[PDB]
Amino acid sequence: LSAEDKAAVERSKMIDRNLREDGEKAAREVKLLLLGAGESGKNTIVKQMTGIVETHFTFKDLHFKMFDVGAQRSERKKWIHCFEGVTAIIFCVALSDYDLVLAEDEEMNRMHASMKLFDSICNNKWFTDTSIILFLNKKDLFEEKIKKSPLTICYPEYAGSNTYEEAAAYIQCQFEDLNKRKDTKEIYTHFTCSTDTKNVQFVFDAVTDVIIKNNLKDCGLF
Amino acid sequence: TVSYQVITSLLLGTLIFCAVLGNACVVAAIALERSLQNVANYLIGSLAVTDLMVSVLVLPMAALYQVLNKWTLGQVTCDLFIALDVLCCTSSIWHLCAIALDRYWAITDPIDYVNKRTPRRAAALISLTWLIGFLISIPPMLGWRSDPDACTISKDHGYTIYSTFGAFYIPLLLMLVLYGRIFRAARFRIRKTVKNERNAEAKRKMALARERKTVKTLGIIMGTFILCWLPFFIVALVLPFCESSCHMPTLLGAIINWLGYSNSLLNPVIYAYFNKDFQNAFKKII
Amino acid sequence: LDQLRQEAEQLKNQIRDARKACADATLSQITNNIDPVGRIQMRTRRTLRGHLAKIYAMHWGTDSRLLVSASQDGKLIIWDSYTTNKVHAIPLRSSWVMTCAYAPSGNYVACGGLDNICSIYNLKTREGNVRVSRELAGHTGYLSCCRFLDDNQIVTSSGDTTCALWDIETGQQTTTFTGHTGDVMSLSLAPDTRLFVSGACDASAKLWDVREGMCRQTFTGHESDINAICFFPNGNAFATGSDDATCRLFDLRADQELMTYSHDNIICGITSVSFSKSGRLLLAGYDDFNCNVWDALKADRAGVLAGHDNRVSCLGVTDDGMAVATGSWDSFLKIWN
Amino acid sequence: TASIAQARKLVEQLKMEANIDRIKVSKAAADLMAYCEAHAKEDPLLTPVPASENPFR
Numbered sequence A: 001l002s003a004e005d006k007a008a009v010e011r012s013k014m015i016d017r018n019l020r021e022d023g024e025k026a027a028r029e030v031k032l033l034l035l036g037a038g039e040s041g042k043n044t045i046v047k048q049m050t051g052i053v054e055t056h057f058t059f060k061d062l063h064f065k066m067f068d069v070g071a072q073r074s075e076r077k078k079w080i081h082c083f084e085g086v087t088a089i090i091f092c093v094a095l096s097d098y099d100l101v102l103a104e105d106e107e108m109n110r111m112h113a114s115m116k117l118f119d120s121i122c123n124n125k126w127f128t129d130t131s132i133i134l135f136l137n138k139k140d141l142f143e144e145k146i147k148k149s150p151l152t153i154c155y156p157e158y159a160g161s162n163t164y165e166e167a168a169a170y171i172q173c174q175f176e177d178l179n180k181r182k183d184t185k186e187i188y189t190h191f192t193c194s195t196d197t198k199n200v201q202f203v204f205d206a207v208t209d210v211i212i213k214n215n216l217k218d219c220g221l222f
Numbered sequence B: 001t002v003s004y005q006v007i008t009s010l011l012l013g014t015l016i017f018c019a020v021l022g023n024a025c026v027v028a029a030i031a032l033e034r035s036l037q038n039v040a041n042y043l044i045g046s047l048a049v050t051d052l053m054v055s056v057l058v059l060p061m062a063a064l065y066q067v068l069n070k071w072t073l074g075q076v077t078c079d080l081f082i083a084l085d086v087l088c089c090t091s092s093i094w095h096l097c098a099i100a101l102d103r104y105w106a107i108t109d110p111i112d113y114v115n116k117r118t119p120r121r122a123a124a125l126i127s128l129t130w131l132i133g134f135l136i137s138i139p140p141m142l143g144w145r146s147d148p149d150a151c152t153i154s155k156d157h158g159y160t161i162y163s164t165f166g167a168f169y170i171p172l173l174l175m176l177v178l179y180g181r182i183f184r185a186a187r188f189r190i191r192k193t194v195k196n197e198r199n200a201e202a203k204r205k206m207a208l209a210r211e212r213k214t215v216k217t218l219g220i221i222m223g224t225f226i227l228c229w230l231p232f233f234i235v236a237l238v239l240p241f242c243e244s245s246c247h248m249p250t251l252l253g254a255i256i257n258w259l260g261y262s263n264s265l266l267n268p269v270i271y272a273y274f275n276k277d278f279q280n281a282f283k284k285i286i
Numbered sequence C: 001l002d003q004l005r006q007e008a009e010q011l012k013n014q015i016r017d018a019r020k021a022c023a024d025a026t027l028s029q030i031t032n033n034i035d036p037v038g039r040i041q042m043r044t045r046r047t048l049r050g051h052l053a054k055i056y057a058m059h060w061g062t063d064s065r066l067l068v069s070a071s072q073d074g075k076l077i078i079w080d081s082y083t084t085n086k087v088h089a090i091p092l093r094s095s096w097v098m099t100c101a102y103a104p105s106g107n108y109v110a111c112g113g114l115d116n117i118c119s120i121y122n123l124k125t126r127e128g129n130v131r132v133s134r135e136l137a138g139h140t141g142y143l144s145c146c147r148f149l150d151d152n153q154i155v156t157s158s159g160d161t162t163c164a165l166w167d168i169e170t171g172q173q174t175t176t177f178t179g180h181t182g183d184v185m186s187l188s189l190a191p192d193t194r195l196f197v198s199g200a201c202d203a204s205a206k207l208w209d210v211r212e213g214m215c216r217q218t219f220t221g222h223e224s225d226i227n228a229i230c231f232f233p234n235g236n237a238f239a240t241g242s243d244d245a246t247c248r249l250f251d252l253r254a255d256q257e258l259m260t261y262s263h264d265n266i267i268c269g270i271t272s273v274s275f276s277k278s279g280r281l282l283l284a285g286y287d288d289f290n291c292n293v294w295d296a297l298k299a300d301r302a303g304v305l306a307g308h309d310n311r312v313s314c315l316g317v318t319d320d321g322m323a324v325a326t327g328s329w330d331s332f333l334k335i336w337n
Numbered sequence D: 001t002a003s004i005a006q007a008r009k010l011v012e013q014l015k016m017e018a019n020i021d022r023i024k025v026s027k028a029a030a031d032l033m034a035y036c037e038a039h040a041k042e043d044p045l046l047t048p049v050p051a052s053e054n055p056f057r
């Protein structure tokens, strides 16, 4: 109608097209939520690949944005729903922490704190159908520490011999038994160390598997 | 007439009304609810539109033909009816093919799914489907270079082979191949997953449940299409070649024709009534 | 230590007794003989579309037609509510926004979130574009709410259990408000901008003097986190909305709670609260996708606004009192009369 | 020395909150009712207005 009204309408249309273009660009992104109890190797994982840290990387033409909220030391349930709708949760746990108590002792193990955090995030109402890539870092240091000291310090009800393979298998079993949504989500467990160069490949494989299984569910085949 | 045309008309009208209602409900749900607006549902809704066009244009004239045992609408209307029947049925079958192909790409190429899959792809698939329908329906209008009481498609051998293979047999082969590859991919993904013994047994039970579910799904998908359209195209292929050797009973021919036509009624149930998103959308809108 | 704890206990008991002494009559008894508001029925006059992710905050401008909305698609969008036109679309450096504010002069907007930064954008430039004017970084937790006092002062609440008054020109914290033990989730300036109330996850509300930076009063009647807070237009009372499925009204001078707005069939949390122009109506957004209009004097459900398919995250009444805006997780804004 | 300092800070904050003067709840409720009655007419959401005066139709 009026010249100013027409200019406003054209401005709004241009803004609309820019917004839809930005949405199209951002839809071609795989969003990952990075978590872990303390510093259990998150930084190592990020190197291998304010208040929230964003790491963007493209692997095999697939773009990933990973959001780390470790420095956010507040009430998690006040913002955890902000990450509803991520493709996957990358949860990092240090295998060497089975004997270390904590930053402040508080007679609670670092491994038990990690297990509690994993249980809470895995069975969170916002992530009923979100998959978890479970990185178990520091396997070399864990092997040394299990050579020197028993695993019974962390898990008193342990019967296997003090060797890396079955100790790590028992730890993985303990972590994966915390999943109550066994018919809705899967846990992709990987033992990592500092020198490993296949972590990004493992994440890519887990993400492609998640995408394919979601498509199968949509087609009624899963 | 007194005891036969009434029940025949009642049954045919009930079928036509149910088909129209189902397809219209699917289209309305997709056009209303934003949770049903993606490429797959766009293909499904395009299939619903094609089946609705069937049930609105072709099915009434076919039902009148069935009840009166005679074509009363004239030669021009007979030609238009044949063209619409061919176009709409071909478009429906190739819509099934397009849905299968999109599912195959989504299951076998997650990278393409994330990066290069857009509603433009659904638009191109629908356009190609309708183009194939036009290509199958045009030769009768162009001449491909009688009985006034009956409306019958051309019985030329060349056009018979052309129409039957370009409308049902090549699509059937494509559907079989695509869903076989999809079945292999699904079986691989299901089997790749497989106290410790209790967890292992639970995982095995879940894998068996998923295998049975995918077998049931593909069985329903392929069996509906086959048991609806295969007898019709078998008859339409073998009958024109043995003109005098084999005769087709009228009752069996009518059963076969309407069995083929029931696919436009069963496709909504298969594609947008068994789907969880569609069920939730219906519950919300109701 | 222990003696100090006992003295603190005695002080708490003394405050409770002094507040119980003032409770002579109930607000329900005082308002029992007034005409009920009736059935309040509003209709969606406008629908604003263009956000592609959840909406977390909106704020009306002082002209009552321009509003700002913030969404996790990393977008700060300024809407003309009359024509539904979009005037600005600000690309956020961090997409994890949880609050936005409109300056009273209309020359600036602010936002913030999980980046712990309060970003101030200038809307009045020579070439007519929007550029980041300032970034306020001192907070060590997520920014939950912010409100301008003028073009150069802004008050923020943070998940680090702290509020802060910022001078925008220098970027420093002019004042820091401490005393909450949980994350501060909401913030409401008094009409004269001399005081402000804040609600936190400690199930407590606190009144702060802007000039002196001290907690005047503490109000504790909620049994869960306080998610929203709003000032009555008098400036002598305020309303708090918590996730115990209850809104509450507190009076500054009476120094206690007057009314509790709750229903048996309402069990979800309250995300946002606001008052009508006269303060007779209290509008509250809920997790169950609906907004409820309460009679603020009789505590009765006057009306329901049901037009969102996801959680109503925010709401705001215009300054002239003509319209109410709701913003939901379903990425749509709605203007109701 | 942090625990005793925090306890003393809480004690002085409690004293500052306690040494205030409060009015009656009946008086506060009467003031709220008076405000709502004095501004009841110019409240469009409480008092629906004709569409000719409605910017949102």
Ligand SMILES: CC(C)CCC[C@@H](C)[C@H]1CC[C@H]2[C@@H]3CC=C4C[C@@H](O)CC[C@]4(C)[C@H]3CC[C@]12C
Binding pocket: B212, B215, B216, B217, B218, B219, B220, B223, B224, B227, B228
């Ligand atoms: C014309 C239409 C209605 C025909 C539909 C036929 C459907 C219902 C039939 C055809 C083939 C059938 C499947 C054949 C084999 C099996 C494997 C068995 O372990 C479970 C049942 C299951 C999975 C059947 C389910 C039902 C099934 C899919």
Ligand SMILES: CC(C)CCC[C@@H](C)[C@H]1CC[C@H]2[C@@H]3CC=C4C[C@@H](O)CC[C@]4(C)[C@H]3CC[C@]12C
Binding pocket: B008, B011, B012, B015, B066, B251, B254, B255, B256, B258, B259, B262, B265
């Ligand atoms: C879901 C349902 C409705 C789909 C399948 C319906 C089937 C059973 C219906 C649809 C149309 C029907 C046909 C319509 C007309 C005639 C002609 C009559 O002289 C004999 C029966 C016969 C040949 C009917 C047989 C049954 C039939 C094929």
Ligand SMILES: COc1ccccc1OCCNCCCOc1ccc2c(c1)NC(=O)CO2
Binding pocket: B062, B063, B065, B066, B069, B085, B086, B087, B089, B090, B136, B151, B153, B163, B164, B167, B236, B254, B257, B260
């Ligand atoms: C040969 O096919 C096709 C060829 C190419 C594409 C699609 C094709 O598929 C057509 C499906 N539709 C055929 C039947 C229409 O013709 C009749 C319908 C009902 C009738 C009769 C004929 N005759 C009766 O006696 C009474 O009922």
